[PDB]
Amino acid sequence: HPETLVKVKDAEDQLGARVGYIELDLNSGKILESFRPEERFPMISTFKVLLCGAVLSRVDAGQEQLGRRIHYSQNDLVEYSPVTEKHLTDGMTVRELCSAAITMSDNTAANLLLTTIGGPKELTAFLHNMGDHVTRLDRWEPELNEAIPNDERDTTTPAAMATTLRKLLTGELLTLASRQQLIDWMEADKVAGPLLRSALPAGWFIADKSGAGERGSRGIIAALGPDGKPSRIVVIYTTGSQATMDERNRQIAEIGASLIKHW
Ligand SMILES: [K+]
Numbered sequence: 001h002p003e004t005l006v007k008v009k010d011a012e013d014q015l016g017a018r019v020g021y022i023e024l025d026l027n028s029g030k031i032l033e034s035f036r037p038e039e040r041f042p043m044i045s046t047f048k049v050l051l052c053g054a055v056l057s058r059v060d061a062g063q064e065q066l067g068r069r070i071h072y073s074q075n076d077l078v079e080y081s082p083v084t085e086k087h088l089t090d091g092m093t094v095r096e097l098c099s100a101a102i103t104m105s106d107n108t109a110a111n112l113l114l115t116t117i118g119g120p121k122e123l124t125a126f127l128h129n130m131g132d133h134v135t136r137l138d139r140w141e142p143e144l145n146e147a148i149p150n151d152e153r154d155t156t157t158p159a160a161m162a163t164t165l166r167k168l169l170t171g172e173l174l175t176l177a178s179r180q181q182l183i184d185w186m187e188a189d190k191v192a193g194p195l196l197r198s199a200l201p202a203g204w205f206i207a208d209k210s211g212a213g214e215r216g217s218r219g220i221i222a223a224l225g226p227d228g229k230p231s232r233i234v235v236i237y238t239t240g241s242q243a244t245m246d247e248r249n250r251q252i253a254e255i256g257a258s259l260i261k262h263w
C-alpha cells in the first residue's frame with residue numbers, strides 16, 4: 001500500500017540516507033510495493049541465510065552432513081563470535097554453525113561455513129544458478145561489511161534478495177526437510193528484536209534475519225504472515241546514515257508498523 005511508501009520516504013528524511021524496500025507476495029511472487037527495488041545495498045549479515053541455503057542444498061545433494069563436526073582454532077576467530085569462541089576445543093557441527101550464524105550472528109561460524117561450500121565465489125555461483133544474477137558475495141567476515149559507498153562487492157538489491165528468499169522458502173530448490181530447517185533457524189528469536197518483530201501482531205509468523213555493518217548499513221529480510229503462516233516477503237536495506245543504531249531501528253520498525261496496518 002502506498003501509505004507504507006510514505007513511511008519509507010519518511011525514513012529517508014529522518015536518516016539522511018537511501019532506504020531500499022520491497023514487499024512480495026510469497027505465493028505468487030507478485031511485487032506488491034517497492035522503493036529503490038533495483039538499487040544495490042550491502043547485504044551485510046543477511047547474506048547468512050543465503051549461505052546456509054547453499055549449505056542445505058549440499059546436504060540435500062549428499063555432499064554435506066549437518067552432523068559433521070568442524071574444528072577450528074583461535075586463528076579462525078574474527079570479531080563477534082559469541083558461540084564459536086566458546087567451542088574452540090569442542091568444535092561445532094555444520095548444523096550448530098548455521099544456527100550460530102543465523103540466530104546468533106556469529107561471524108566465525110559464517111566463515112567456517114563459507115569454507116565448506118567453496119567460499120564467496122561458490123555462494124555467488126549458487127545464486128546465479130538459481131536465477132539470481134544480481135546478488136554477489138566477494139569477501140569474508142568481517143570485510144564484507146565495509147559498505148564502501150558505490151562499491152558493488154557484497155551487495156544485493158531489494159528485488160533480487162526478495163525473489164531469492166522466496167525461491168529458497170518455496171518451490172523445489174530445497175527438500176522440505178531443508179526448507180523447514182532454514183525457516184526454523186530464521187524463526188529463532190535472538191537478534192532481530194527491535195525491528196519488524198516489534199510491530200508484529202499476536203499469532204503472526206515471522207522468519208527473519210537482520211544485519212548491521214559499517215557506515216550505517218542495516219538490513220532485514222523476512223517472510224511473515226498472520227495465523228502462524230507466512231504469506232509475504234519483506235526486504236529493507238539502508239546504508240550511509242549517520243544516525244544512531246536506535247534511530248535506524250525505529251525507522252525500520254515504523255515501516256513494519258505501516259506494512260502491518262495496511263496488510
Ligand atoms: K586459519
Ligand SMILES: [K+]
Nearest residue numbers: 186188208209
Ligand atoms: K531471526
